[PDB]
Design a protein around this ligand. Structure first.
Ligand SMILES: [Zn+2]
Ligand SMILES: [Zn+2]
Length: 71
């Protein structure tokens, strides 16, 4: 990478199909808060705030723990 930031935000976000994905997705309590903040949040996959807009692991962990097309 060109900068040592250590943070990446994903192409699909709340629509990402694999539950173990290491990149950045929105709060699981709301799919319509896009990611604007380039920071790893504190509750991650249990962040209950519907107005958060930070970086989390994949929503497929609470949504659909079974991948397809990525499998
Ligand atoms: Zn992803
Ligand atoms: Zn959060």
């Amino acid at each position: 990478g060109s900068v040592q930031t250590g943070i990446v935000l994903c192409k699909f976000g709340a629509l990402c199909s694999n539950p173990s994905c290491p990149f950045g997705h929105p709060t699981p309590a709301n799919e319509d808060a896009k990611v604007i903040d380039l920071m790893w949040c504190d509750k991650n996959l249990t962040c209950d705030n519907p107005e958060c807009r930070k970086a989390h692991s994949s929503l497929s962990k609470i949504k659909e723990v079974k991948p397809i097309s990525q499998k």
